[PDB]
Design a binder for this molecule. Structure first.
Ligand code: CA
Ligand code: CA
Lengths: 344, 31, 344, 31
């Protein structure tokens, strides 16, 4: 999993940096793995400079046997019998009347577990939209009920590639509801808003990053196969959120050094953490173009002939929706990414 | 005894520990 | 299951009659359900007079919601947790570089459980042949190890549709090996060959068909969800096998009246049955053409535009291989049918 | 007591009893 996780994490960091450039102070919440999965399925059908752009920006070109490694990753993430709910699912919706290459379809099905659903984009794009949305809603236990809004698909849509990811796990160490009190959350040096602050003191993997004046905490979920990692500046010491120096030097390399299990030590920690819930929506198309994924979205330049043998398709939009609810018991998190492919 | 009082903006992510893959990644800065 | 089983049984009777016309005295062994399944998947992609011919000869036109009923039938046949092994599997092998219609592929996958395997017919038809054969061999527990021999696929093959069926069940009432003795089997009025004749006396569903001078016996397998039904003339009373009058009046209607559970009664029966094993091979193409399936096999007339949107494909061959081993413990039976689709 | 001595050619089939479908159908006439 070595090469693939490094690649996926490098992309995660690049995409967070791009989103931060558009919004340096608001809440941000994404599933990087969900986005990398949708783009890995698209990459199967791309050729030429379109493919080269996708593999460079997504770091797929740094992974030997990329699609085989993803296949193994999906098998592990979806393993049955775990003490938490974790689902990562892929699906293809194709226009009924459209012809796809056999090898493209066989590979997305074998490597990504994506089965092909045949829908009527040409005569009934609304029914098709609602079918896609119902599937994502079902995969995310209702948390992403309308991934694609009116106008996202029309009678010219030929293919929609969809990834949904869902997680619900209890904390290894739960907070007691009775210790949760109203407390002030400082947005910056002088605005304050009241939050429900949860409290517990327990031994957790921990570190203070001396040179960044930042604390790192790991909060295991039940089973310890997933953890939440939190990076918290010692104080708000800049003219916005307090995170500016961390975000400034966020790299694959530093993120790894800060949060590596080997670099955390068990400490008895007083944890105050707000109870919170985020629902976010992104049109990733322009952010991805800024990252170097250009021909893919360009009607005249896109090479998707791996999907139908001709340069007649392009990707109009990649959209991402996400959800997280963090409380005393644990965390329920969901996301879904759709890439819409239209006739060029 | 350490103190981790997250009453100001922080970055958080959910990691799949066996593979080290980041499943979800966020910044909480605006309640 | 009412309409579909009647249809499938009517076809079974028609195809047995056709095979009997080519060989009125040899052993015959087929899986009718296997052949009907391969043709039901082909029928999904046929249009025009090609479709009309297939549905008439296979009786699919007498079944409302034919493919949905087959989907239900496959679910029941393959149900987990049964006290016998019964597998009915479908698969599609498509040329890597060929483009298929989305709706055709989605339907064969949803209704028949056939997944698409992408193979290299164009550059490496031998590897593709061996891949198909290995899959069928695996599905039939080694009993059909080479469904398609050299020359059955070439670099012009675009699609091979495959059904395999496998059954192994113990008798509800097993024969004791120690009671099995050599005894003479009469092929006709004066040739004889020695067989291992098994013996037991037990209560079995039974009937003597008075007007045909024929006995009917039902031998349940363990669980009683499958039975073997045997129709035995009272003696060899014609100038060949003894079965001529039965075969003469074999119809869906008579077969039903002779072997219906309602028409059998429990009787204490002395059963002498040979231990035997058959392996048969059929090129069904001409028999099916004789049955009325003509355009499908004709390069100029075949309409398979449901598979790729164009009239550029036709079926060159439908071949069927089968196997049965009947002994004291039970029966192991296997069959597989491949329809090879080439460029017209 | 009945006698079913199959020492001459017969037709046989394996039926799926719930659906009444014939899974396999044959004639044994040549050992
Ligand atoms: Ca559910
Ligand atoms: Ca096996």
């Amino acid at each position: 999993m070595e090469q693939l996780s490094t690649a996926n994490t490098h992309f995660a960091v690049d995409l967070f940096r791009a989103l931060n450039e558009s919004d340096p102070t608001g809440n941000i919440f994404i599933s990087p793995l969900s986005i990398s999965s949708a783009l890995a399925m698209i990459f199967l059908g791309t050729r030429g400079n379109t493919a080269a752009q996708v593999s460079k920006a997504l770091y797929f070109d740094t992974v030997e046997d990329i699609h085989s490694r993803f296949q193994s990753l999906n098998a592990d993430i979806n393993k049955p019998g775990a003490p938490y709910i974790l689902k990562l699912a892929n699906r293809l919706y194709g226009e009924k009347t459209y012809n796809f290459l056999a090898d493209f379809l066989a590979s997305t099905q074998k490597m990504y577990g994506a089965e092909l659903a045949s829908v009527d984009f040409q005569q009934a794009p609304e029914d098709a939209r609602k079918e896609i949305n119902e599937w994502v809603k079902g995969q995310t236990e209702g948390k992403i009920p309308e991934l694609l809004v009116k106008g996202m698909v029309d009678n010219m849509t030929k293919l929609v590639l969809v990834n949904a990811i869902y997680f619900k796990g209890n904390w290894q160490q739960k907070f007691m509801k009775e210790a949760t009190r109203d407390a002030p959350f400082r947005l910056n040096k002088k605005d304050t808003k009241t939050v429900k602050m949860m409290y517990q003191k327990k031994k957790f993997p921990y570190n203070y990053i001396e040179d960044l004046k930042c604390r790192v905490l790991e909060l295991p979920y039940q089973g310890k196969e997933l953890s939440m990692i939190i990076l918290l500046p010692d104080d708000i010491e800049d003219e916005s959120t307090g995170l500016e120096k961390i975000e400034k030097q966020l790299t694959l390399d530093k993120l790894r050094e800060w949060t590596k299990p080997e670099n955390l030590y068990l400490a008895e920690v007083n944890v105050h953490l707000p109870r919170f819930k985020l629902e976010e929506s992104y049109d990733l198309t322009s952010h991805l173009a800024r990252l170097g994924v250009q021909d893919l979205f360009n009607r005249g330049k896109a090479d998707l002939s791996g999907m139908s043998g001709a340069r007649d398709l392009f990707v109009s939009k990649i959209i991402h929706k996400s959800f997280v609810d963090l409380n005393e018991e644990g965390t329920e998190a969901a996301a879904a990414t759709a890439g819409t492919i239209l006739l060029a | 005894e350490e103190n981790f009082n997250a009453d100001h903006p922080f970055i958080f992510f959910i990691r799949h520990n066996p593979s080290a893959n980041i499943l979800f990644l966020g910044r909480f800065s605006s309640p």
